[PDB]
Amino acid sequence: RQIFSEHLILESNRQTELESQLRNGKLLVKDFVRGLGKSEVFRRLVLEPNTNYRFVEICLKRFLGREPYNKQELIKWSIIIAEKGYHAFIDAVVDGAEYAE
Amino acid sequence: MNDVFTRAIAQADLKGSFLLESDLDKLASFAKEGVKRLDAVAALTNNAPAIISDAAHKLFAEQQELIQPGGNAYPHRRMAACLRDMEIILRYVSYALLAGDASVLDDRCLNGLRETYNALGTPTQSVARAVQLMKDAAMVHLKSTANVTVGDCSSLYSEAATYFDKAAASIA
Amino acid sequence: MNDVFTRAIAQADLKGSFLLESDLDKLASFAKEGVKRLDAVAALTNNAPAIISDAAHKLFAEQQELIQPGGNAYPHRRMAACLRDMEIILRYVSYALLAGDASVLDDRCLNGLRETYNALGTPTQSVARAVQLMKDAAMVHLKSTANVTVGDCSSLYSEAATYFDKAAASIA
Amino acid sequence: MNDVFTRAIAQADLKGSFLLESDLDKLASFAKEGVKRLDAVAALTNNAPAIISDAAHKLFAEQQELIQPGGNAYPHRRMAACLRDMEIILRYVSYALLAGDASVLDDRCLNGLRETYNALGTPTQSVARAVQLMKDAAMVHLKSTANVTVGDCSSLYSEAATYFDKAAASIA
Amino acid sequence: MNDVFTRAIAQADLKGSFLLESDLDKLASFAKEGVKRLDAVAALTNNAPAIISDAAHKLFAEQQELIQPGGNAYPHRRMAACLRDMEIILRYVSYALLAGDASVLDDRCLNGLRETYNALGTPTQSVARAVQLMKDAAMVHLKSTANVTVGDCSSLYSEAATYFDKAAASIA
Amino acid sequence: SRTVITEVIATADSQGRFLNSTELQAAFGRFERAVPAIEAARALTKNQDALVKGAVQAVFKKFPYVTQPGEKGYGDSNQAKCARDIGYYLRFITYSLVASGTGPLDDYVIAGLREVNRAFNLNPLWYIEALNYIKGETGKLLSGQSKTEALLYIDHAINALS
Amino acid sequence: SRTVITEVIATADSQGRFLNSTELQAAFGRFERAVPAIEAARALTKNQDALVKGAVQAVFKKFPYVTQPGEKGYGDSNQAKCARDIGYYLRFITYSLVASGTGPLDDYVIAGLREVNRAFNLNPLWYIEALNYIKGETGKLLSGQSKTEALLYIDHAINALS
Amino acid sequence: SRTVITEVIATADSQGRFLNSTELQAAFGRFERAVPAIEAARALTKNQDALVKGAVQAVFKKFPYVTQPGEKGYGDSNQAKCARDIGYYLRFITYSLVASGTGPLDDYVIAGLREVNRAFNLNPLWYIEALNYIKGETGKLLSGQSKTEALLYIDHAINALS
Amino acid sequence: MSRTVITEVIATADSQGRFLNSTELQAAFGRFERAVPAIEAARALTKNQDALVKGAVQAVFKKFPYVTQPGEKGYGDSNQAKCARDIGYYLRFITYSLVASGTGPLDDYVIAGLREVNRAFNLNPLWYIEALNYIKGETGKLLSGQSKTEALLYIDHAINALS
Amino acid sequence: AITTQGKRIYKITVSEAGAYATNKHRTGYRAPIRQSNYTLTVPYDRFLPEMIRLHQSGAKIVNVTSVIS
Ligand SMILES: CCC1=C(C)/C(=C/C2=NC(=C\c3[nH]c(/C=C4\NC(=O)[C@H](C)[C@H]4CC)c(C)c3CCC(=O)O)/C(CCC(=O)O)=C2C)NC1=O
Ligand SMILES: CCC1=C(C)/C(=C/C2=NC(=C\c3[nH]c(/C=C4\NC(=O)[C@H](C)[C@H]4CC)c(C)c3CCC(=O)O)/C(CCC(=O)O)=C2C)NC1=O
Ligand SMILES: CCC1=C(C)/C(=C/C2=NC(=C\c3[nH]c(/C=C4\NC(=O)[C@H](C)[C@H]4CC)c(C)c3CCC(=O)O)/C(CCC(=O)O)=C2C)NC1=O
Ligand SMILES: CCC1=C(C)/C(=C/C2=NC(=C\c3[nH]c(/C=C4\NC(=O)[C@H](C)[C@H]4CC)c(C)c3CCC(=O)O)/C(CCC(=O)O)=C2C)NC1=O
Ligand SMILES: CCC1=C(C)/C(=C/C2=NC(=C\c3[nH]c(/C=C4\NC(=O)[C@H](C)[C@H]4CC)c(C)c3CCC(=O)O)/C(CCC(=O)O)=C2C)NC1=O
Ligand SMILES: CCC1=C(C)/C(=C/C2=NC(=C\c3[nH]c(/C=C4\NC(=O)[C@H](C)[C@H]4CC)c(C)c3CCC(=O)O)/C(CCC(=O)O)=C2C)NC1=O
Ligand SMILES: CCC1=C(C)/C(=C/C2=NC(=C\c3[nH]c(/C=C4\NC(=O)[C@H](C)[C@H]4CC)c(C)c3CCC(=O)O)/C(CCC(=O)O)=C2C)NC1=O
Ligand SMILES: CCC1=C(C)/C(=C/C2=NC(=C\c3[nH]c(/C=C4\NC(=O)[C@H](C)[C@H]4CC)c(C)c3CCC(=O)O)/C(CCC(=O)O)=C2C)NC1=O
Ligand SMILES: CCC1=C(C)/C(=C/C2=NC(=C\c3[nH]c(/C=C4\NC(=O)[C@H](C)[C@H]4CC)c(C)c3CCC(=O)O)/C(CCC(=O)O)=C2C)NC1=O
Ligand SMILES: CCC1=C(C)/C(=C/C2=NC(=C\c3[nH]c(/C=C4\NC(=O)[C@H](C)[C@H]4CC)c(C)c3CCC(=O)O)/C(CCC(=O)O)=C2C)NC1=O
Ligand SMILES: CCC1=C(C)/C(=C/C2=NC(=C\c3[nH]c(/C=C4\NC(=O)[C@H](C)[C@H]4CC)c(C)c3CCC(=O)O)/C(CCC(=O)O)=C2C)NC1=O
Ligand SMILES: CCC1=C(C)/C(=C/C2=NC(=C\c3[nH]c(/C=C4\NC(=O)[C@H](C)[C@H]4CC)c(C)c3CCC(=O)O)/C(CCC(=O)O)=C2C)NC1=O
């Protein structure tokens, strides 16, 4: 619900590998969140419709829990996507200082 | 993200009907020329450093005010950002050339880029000029007859020109 | 996680020299049979729920104490867990059969499954029995010549047998 | 993390039968005396800070080596940590009191606290002694019947003694 | 993660008394030659790539089994790890030199390096010989009296040699 | 949707790299397989009416009781919706054939299938029976390789339902 | 123990690069300046006992009910351990003066100050007064750089108290 | 390492699903390029001995100043290192052609390339033009599918170098 | 937005949500003492800018003869001019860093994006390393005592980042 | 993570003994406190950053094992 927004909670969207790893205890919550971000459903349902900047806004609201400070933050974050993939964007967000704090 | 096949499928589904035999024939012709399309895409991919370097040299010969102190490409970070932007746009053009539809290029690259450049103070006309220079330096490479079978790739050349012009018109 | 071709390449790298001609012919002979291996893996995938259903029916016909209260697969969630384990075992075995290398199956699926069942109290012999039941069902579905051309695939069936046997022995 | 009702249901499911009328009778006997248990737990909760202050004062009194430098309880932050440990173990005993089962005690922290205190180096018999003496201090408050209607409280005292001593024996 | 001054204060806390004036004299002398050790640390940081390059060159010259296929640093990304590890080790040694205590060295990654190199299969004797090689190179680099004022620094050299040898003995 | 080309491009775009040789090999495989798939799509498009009507009738045969009063199959409207749904499944199978990927099915049909079937109490077994009928008649209508493609997609739909 | 040089090492270790100029030259400021700080540490060592007693009776003075029976002040051994605690605080002041940083103070005494204060009904105001008294003495005992060395740590201690 | 079917299994494993029409079509397109890439690797392995010498000589031709003393190119052991580098590149190109994917060349050469070339002070343009010479000579050794596979892989290595 | 002593102090105080403690103002005092040799060095280095740049250009050409012949990067009057301009840039940012008492000007204006620009334009880092080594040699004479060390720290930092 | 290096996961046994406890007592607890010893599985790509985080955070690791190979 925090990542996929409760309307994508469908049996087709259900990451079962991540869930089983979590249930084992071999997966951290940070890694479960990251794996949900780095998933086909998150790219196809969230990244593809939106531009890099609106996708950054969504990811800041959902992963950090806070809306972007201004449009310049959208701009500075969108370059990670544009140049290294939204996988590198998600890794930067979830392995950042703010998420860890 | 759409290619030609998914574009046809989506339009047919909006009409709520199967694909007509004309549409299937069009897609068959597309698939038949797909090998030439792959050749052009590989030419663009393998020559990305050459294309970017030539476009940069030409652009900074034409527009010296970029590389002057107080210009928009003056320090090393700004020059590296310039070259990075050119590489990214070339990447999305090659994606759109493989797919056959400019939907990926417009959706993922150009959809809000002019607003970004205005917010950054970047001359959008200079970015468009760099994109046209990459067009020239690329069609130099797409037309390289050597090492491949000879044939009529005029349609692919027109398609690549349209994608580059779409990029330039979107940024500026 | 490798395919057999990567195994040969890595061995060549370890011994420093190129691939011998014997190795190259072995790899080419495997590869020309690849369009013949695709039908086998497609037969495993297209019939996967049927294989799982029949294997579960036979497995729970053989042993009732599991379904019985106090048994390992008595609670409804634990029955679902049983079903999902059979599913994943079959899926990763099909992965390995396609790859022609059994290392993927050990590296990603079978690495710590035995220890997981040791920690969870599940009898490993029952999982081995389930894997062998899926062995039988998979062979049945693989032999079906309907909708495919006739041919001699003894290598494929024997390889699938070895893969399922290794998985079953690994679990217990 | 189990309740007396939860434990009864667990055994009933294990034997596969319904809940026997004797088990229901004992659950009803427990439930009719619920306000007993709630008043004890609530008084313990309300008077916990005074209990912990008294416990700290005495454990400083009889045990002296800690308070001077070099002991496993000199520093001020280490004092905050010790107060937190005594508070949380008192709270866990309160949990076991309300639930009526020690599984809420044994499973959660007692398992790991053993190796934790072995690794830290702080003596465990001192911890058990502090548990017993804080039990006495809390029991003194638990006697207080004022502001509340009078009644019997022996069974709750026996259960609390069992749980405190169980925690001490686990730690020791 | 404790400085020599912090370490001395830690023993003062352990004794629970003040710092004796003799220890104060030692610490004042340490802060007096702090200029000298800062120059040493600057000479270590500024010439870090040169030291690492010389150490790598002669380490690979002396031991050929690593570069060759199947060697611990053959795949051309394992040498990435080799050079990165050597740089990290010299960063830690510079940290220790500035702090004047090995506690900052022990706390961060001396404990884990041994077991990580055990798990990876990296031989520790090669790493230790590399540490001696960087020790010799850094000794030579810091000996350079040019561009700096002349003075007595044998104490610093002994400290640095002890730190490098201690790191190598820890990994080996 | 999700085709070979789209997976290639999206995988490149998620690592932020240019399309390299392996991606172009996959695209080449798609472009070579396009001919049998388009042939299969044309075959299933020509005979859509016979396939849909026969599938509906096979569904009714397997479950006669559904067409009884008070059940889902009674009434002209419900059987018209039956024919409509089988037409949807056939349309998306042909779309997946042309696209050379299960993307059209995974997006249009399979995404949200369980929720919708459980909400309207539609038995998946009806649709599996209809798809099995389509599977059977594809063998007659299609020979050789286009049959294999159509069967791959119909099997994917069936496994999605069951 | 977050001392300035150790903080340098940490804030470089979290990153992948060596100690740059700012770090080295801040260490240089410390290495020049340590002499007045350690001088003030030894000076406060020489005057420990007088500061201990004087602060004890100063806190006795401005808050009279402590002198009154029925409070924490009442009790001979109580007052003895009160003097022991103020001696702890002066020892930590000397520790911080030696360390050229606020690390030793925050390591032991400030860390979890409010929790222990509440648990033992020892509000910070009494210690605030004691440290104001000790600051008044350090105002006359030490002059020059060492005066500032004493005053800054005394102020950090009182700010942590308040 | 990585191949085409390796990427297929990786994608399917990530999505937690069985191999579909897209993935098996990619595997088919990979197995169709099996034997032409095999013959390309065969041809490059046959001639390697002349290519390595020609490559180091073309390197010296492109950078005459390197050969003179006081530079990297001067020294017989340096000559052997040049030959070994060229042999490594050609060997991994053959491995990649056998594997039908740029994986072995990615993990055996490209991974860690820039920082090694910087740390050992090896100029990448040397290898860029050495691979350019190897490209020129593969232009004549082979023709057909094998030649274009060799061209793609060599060009990928070249773009990696720059 | 540079990373200087004062600004690193302010940033590490802000991140912890606290006022500037003793040690922060303490390091700031160290910096304000540092500044006098730094400004002296920057003055002595900005006065001699043209001779330094000229000597650096000539030294680079001497150490790299091959760049001078036809068909290379160094052939041509325009490439001469851009060599002089690049070395002037490096010198100007070294003086900036001296004044600011930090590597912020160099790390932001020159170092960040250095490798990408060099690679794209096929510029060899060794040219600028030799130019900066010449500048180091000359500022060995131009500067005395503290100022020489302060200038050499930043020239060494630039050289290390070039390598 | 597809390559051979993305393989070969590693298990790490971590204890949060007093070196971690001091720094966390200074900084403070944002979350409830857990047991000292735990087994944490990390891939090779994240192996180095994870150990850097563990060492900087002040924890002491008990034993490192190669789960794969
Ligand atoms: C922030 C500071 C800064 C630096 C350092 C900088 C370096 C720099 N030098 C450039 C041109 C150049 N610079 C040189 C330098 C060479 N000339 C030869 O005489 C020497 C051997 C050698 C110098 C030692 C050359 C050859 C070029 C032309 C490269 C080309 O365009 O192909 C360019 C490309 C802009 C153009 O085409 O004019 C940059 C970005 N730019 C900056 O904004
Ligand atoms: C995939 C879609 C996409 C693209 C392409 C994109 C480009 C982009 N260009 C940027 C800045 C920039 N872009 C340029 C390039 C321009 N200025 C020069 O003069 C040239 C004339 C011209 C290039 C030909 C420069 C110099 C900057 C730096 C601005 C700055 O750092 O202040 C930035 C933000 C700054 C950063 O984080 O580094 C982005 C995000 N963003 C996107 O979401
Ligand atoms: C592994 C990745 C891959 C590559 C590298 C590739 C190249 C490639 N190009 C081919 C034919 C061709 N290639 C071209 C393209 C050329 N025409 C002009 O000369 C242009 C310079 C240039 C494109 C802009 C043409 C026109 C054909 C023949 C088309 C036909 O016969 O149908 C063929 C088939 C050989 C044949 O038709 O006899 C291949 C394999 N295909 C791939 O799947
Ligand atoms: C990497 C791929 C992967 C595999 C292979 C996998 C298997 C797996 N099955 C599990 C549970 C389980 N699995 C079973 C299966 C047994 N029941 C018996 O009927 C059968 C003989 C046997 C099935 C073959 C049971 C009973 C449990 C629950 C055990 C318990 O709760 O105590 C668990 C524990 C974690 C969880 O389910 O949340 C794993 C990891 N999980 C994965 O992510
Ligand atoms: C899109 C996915 C895809 C599949 C599924 C595929 C399979 C495939 N199987 C083929 C023939 C064959 N298929 C098989 C396999 C079957 N023979 C026996 O009945 C066994 C029961 C069974 C093996 C388990 C065999 C043995 C051949 C003949 C081998 C040959 O072509 O020489 C052929 C070549 C002739 C044709 O069908 O047009 C293909 C392309 N290719 C693909 O691109
Ligand atoms: C899961 C619930 C939980 C438990 C079980 C728990 C016990 C516990 N006590 C600890 C250390 C400690 N334990 C004690 C208490 C001992 N020393 C003396 O005072 C006494 C003899 C004795 C108490 C009666 C002290 C003082 C420390 C601090 C050690 C240090 O900071 O170095 C630690 C190490 C990490 C930390 O303190 O944050 C734990 C986990 N804490 C919890 O959050
Ligand atoms: C806000 C939460 C809450 C509390 C605090 C609570 C206390 C509480 N206990 C009651 C009954 C009672 N409660 C007790 C228990 C007391 N007898 C003594 O031994 C001890 C001081 C203590 C047990 C440790 C007794 C003896 C009764 C009379 C009913 C009976 O047990 O027969 C009553 C009903 C008063 C009446 O009889 O008219 C209340 C309000 N009830 C609540 O819902
Ligand atoms: C911020 C970094 C830093 C710099 C820039 C620096 C330069 C420097 N060197 C100095 C003296 C000195 N410099 C050294 C350096 C040693 N002498 C030998 O030649 C060795 C090769 C060499 C290093 C091991 C020594 C031993 C002294 C005299 C120490 C003393 O008398 O206290 C002084 C104090 C004298 C004055 O005020 O003019 C400074 C400022 N020192 C530093 O810590
Ligand atoms: C915080 C700092 C820290 C370090 C540096 C550390 C050591 C370390 N070395 C590693 C691999 C490696 N390290 C080396 C280097 C050694 N092997 C020999 O050949 C060289 C002479 C020698 C250089 C000192 C090599 C070759 C590997 C690759 C082994 C492999 O691929 O598994 C790895 C695996 C992570 C990765 O490579 O991405 C670690 C964590 N652990 C730490 O927590
Ligand atoms: C993307 C493709 C797609 C499909 C496949 C689809 C199926 C579908 N069929 C529906 C109605 C229905 N569909 C049927 C089908 C039954 N009729 C006969 O009896 C057979 C036994 C059986 C068919 C094999 C029936 C009975 C209803 C009416 C159910 C109701 O109104 O509650 C509905 C409810 C919405 C409405 O029409 O009001 C859906 C969503 N919808 C879609 O958008
Ligand atoms: C070095 C680490 C450390 C610190 C920081 C520390 C503070 C501290 N002071 C305490 C008691 C005390 N603190 C004071 C001081 C205050 N009370 C009166 O109101 C005075 C007016 C006022 C003095 C200005 C007194 C008098 C006590 C004795 C209370 C008692 O135990 O009876 C206690 C209770 C346990 C004990 O020490 O016996 C602690 C933990 N203790 C430590 O081991
Ligand atoms: C399997 C992956 C792999 C690659 C790619 C590889 C290249 C390579 N060649 C090296 C040595 C070297 N290689 C050369 C050759 C270059 N310099 C000139 O002679 C020529 C123009 C040019 C050759 C075209 C030289 C000179 C050295 C010595 C390093 C030095 O002098 O600084 C080194 C440094 C370690 C050593 O071998 O001693 C590497 C990493 N080694 C590998 O294990």
Residue numbers in the entry:
A (entry chain 4): 52 to 152
B (entry chain k), C (entry chain i), D (entry chain g), E (entry chain h): 1 to 172
F (entry chain d), G (entry chain a), H (entry chain c): 2 to 163
I (entry chain b): 1 to 163
J (entry chain m): 10 to 78
What do the authors of the reporting publication say about this deposited model?
Phycobilisomes (PBS) are antenna megacomplexes that transfer energy to photosystems II and I in thylakoids. Here we show the cryo-EM structure at a global resolution of 2.9 Å of the 5.9-MDa PBS from Anthocerotibacter panamensis (hereafter A. panamensis), a recently discovered Gloeobacterial species that diverged from Gloeobacter spp. around 1.4 billion years ago. The A. panamensis PBS features a configuration comprising two herein characterized linkers and presents a paddle-shaped morphology. The two-fold symmetric PBS contains twelve APC hexamers assembled as a heptacylindrical core surrounded by twelve PC hexamers, with approximate dimensions of 273 Å (width), 500 Å (height), and 129 Å (thickness).
The top and bottom AP cylinders also use different linkers to connect to PC hexamers. For the bottom pentacylindrical portion of the core, two common CpcG linkers tether the Rb and Rb’ PC hexamers to the A/A’ cylinders, whereas, at the top, an unusual combination of CpcJ and CpcN is used. Two CpcJ linkers connect four side PC hexamers (Rs1/Rs2 and Rs1’/Rs2’) to the D/D’ cylinders via the inter-domain linker. Although previous studies proposed CpcJ as a linker in Gv742128–30, our study is the first to demonstrate its function structurally. In contrast, the final resolution of PC hexamers ranged from 2.74 Å to 4.10 Å.
